[PDB]
Design an enzyme around this catalytic site. Structure first.
Site, PDB file in Angstrom:
ATOM      1  CD  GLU A  10      -3.146  -1.421   0.282  1.00 29.67           C
ATOM      2  OE1 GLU A  10      -3.427   0.242  -0.374  1.00 29.67           O
ATOM      3  OE2 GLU A  10      -3.835  -1.778  -0.045  1.00 29.67           O
ATOM      4  CG  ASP A  19      -8.408   2.887  -4.908  1.00 25.81           C
ATOM      5  OD1 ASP A  19      -8.655   3.754  -5.828  1.00 25.81           O
ATOM      6  OD2 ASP A  19      -9.111   1.992  -4.534  1.00 25.81           O
TER       7      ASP A  19
END
Ligand code: YGS
Length: 157
Positions: A10, A19
């Site tokens: 991440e 994202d």
């Protein structure tokens, strides 16, 4: 461990970002909202942190959200009648791969779950790759799948 693994997958960003699906996110992959409104994301952020953040957090705050998010993924597994038996059947390394998937996608993998519970690792790996998940985030999916296939950290090392 799951924290190091997801930190690799991440990253860490202290300002609101989008994202891979275009959704407002912050920290170590903390989803804020699927709404296209940055104001809505900023409201979610302030609610999550407990102060007026203006779209920016500290590393400590990001790490605390990350702990909460990993905990929530584990609880989603343990409360789910389909996921819990498979998770309980796995060794510790493969349990991390399971948490990773739930962290990324939340609570269609019925056949992969069966293969994992049966410990048919190569077959599960083939089935897991036949997914939107694999096609849209192939490098991350390959790392997770390699973890399921081998029960080692080789993809992360
Ligand atoms: C979705 C998968 C095939 C991986 C998994 C396994 C067990 C519990 C949660 C996720």
């Amino acid at each position: 461990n799951i924290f190091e693994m997801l930190r690799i997958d991440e990253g860490l960003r202290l300002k609101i970002y989008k994202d891979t699906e275009g959704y407002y996110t912050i920290g170590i992959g903390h989803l804020l909202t699927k709404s296209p409104s940055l104001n809505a994301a900023k409201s979610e952020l302030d609610k999550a942190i407990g102060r007026n953040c203006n779209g920016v957090i500290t590393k400590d705050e990001a790490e605390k959200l990350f702990n909460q998010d990993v905990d929530a993924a584990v609880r989603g597994i343990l409360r789910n009648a389909k996921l819990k038996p498979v998770y309980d059947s796995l060794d510790a390394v493969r349990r991390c791969a399971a948490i990773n998937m739930v962290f990324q996608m939340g609570e269609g993998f019925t056949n992969s779950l069966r293969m994992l519970q049966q410990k048919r690792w190569d077959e599960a790996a083939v089935n897991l790759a036949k997914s939107r998940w694999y096609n849209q985030t192939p490098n991350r999916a390959k790392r997770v799948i390699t973890t399921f296939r081998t029960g080692t950290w080789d993809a992360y090392k």
